[PDB]
Design a binder for this molecule. Sequence first.
Ligand SMILES: CN(C)c1ccc2c(c1)CCN(c1cccc(-c3cc(Nc4ccc(C(=O)N5CCOCC5)cn4)c(=O)n(C)c3)c1CO)C2=O
Length: 263
Amino acid sequence: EIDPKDLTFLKELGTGQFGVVKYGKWRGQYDVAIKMIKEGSMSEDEFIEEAKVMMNLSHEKLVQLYGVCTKQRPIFIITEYMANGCLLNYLREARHAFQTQQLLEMCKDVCEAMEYLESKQFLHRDLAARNCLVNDQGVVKVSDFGLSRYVLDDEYTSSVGSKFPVRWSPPEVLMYSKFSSKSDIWAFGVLMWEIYSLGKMPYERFTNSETAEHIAQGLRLYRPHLASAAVYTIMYSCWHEKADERPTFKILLSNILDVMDEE
Ligand SMILES: CN(C)c1ccc2c(c1)CCN(c1cccc(-c3cc(Nc4ccc(C(=O)N5CCOCC5)cn4)c(=O)n(C)c3)c1CO)C2=O
C-alpha cells in the first residue's frame, strides 16, 4: 500500500482499458507511472486481493509493480516508468532503423519475462506489442499481465466482442474459451511477427471474423521480409494446431539464443 501523499502527477501518458495513466514521481525521487482506475471499469475488490500475489512477481523484463492506493477512489496502480512507451508505436517509427539483431533481442526480452511467468503458472492472456513497453535503454518489458481478469467491459472480455484480441488468439480460445500456457505461446508467436513486420497489424488485409476462419483452415501469418528461415520456424512453432505440440517459453528462449549465436 502506497501513501498517495508520496505521489506527484506531472504529465498524462494516455488512456487504456482502466482510464487515464499519468507520469509522476514517488517519494520526490523515483519516476513512476500511475494508473488512475476509472469508476466502473475494473472489478476492484478482486484486483485488490490479486495485487498481493502480483507484488511478488519480479523480473528484469517485467514492468515492476511498486504498489497500489486503495483506501480511496479512484484507486491507483503505481509502476516502473518506461520512458519510450508502448512497443507497437516504437516499432512503427522508421527513424529507429532497427537491425535484425535488435529485433531478435526484443523477442528475447519478452521471452525471458514470459518464461518467468510460465514458471509461476501465471497467464498473461493479452500478450501483444501494444501491451509491451520500452524503457530508456531500449529494453522491452512485458506489461499489464493478468489484468484482463478484472476488466468489466464485455466488448474486451467476450470472444465475440469488438475489443477481444482475436488476431493474437489460438483456435481453441476463439472456439471453446480454452485458455492455457499454450494460448500465451500462440500470442507470443504473433508478437514476434509484429516485431519483425515493424508493427504491421497481424492479418492486415482481413477482419477479425476472416482471421478466425483463416486460422481454423490451418493457414497462418506469412514470413516477414526481415525474418530469416530460422526466425520464422520459431514464430511458426507457436502456431501448431495442437496446443500440446507448441513449445514452452523455456524452449523458445533456447531457440532464440541459438539463432542469436547463429546469425
Ligand atoms: C487489461 N489490459 C491488458 C490492459 C489494461 C490497461 C492498459 C493496457 C492493457 C495497456 C495500455 N495501457 C496504458 C495506457 C496509457 C499508458 C500506459 C503506460 C505508458 C508508459 N510510458 C510512456 C512513456 C512515454 C509515452 C509517450 O507519450 N511517448 C510519445 C513519444 O514517443 C515516445 C513515448 C507514453 N507512455 C508507462 O511507462 N507505463 C508503465 C504505462 C499504459 C500501459 O500500462 C493500460 O493502462
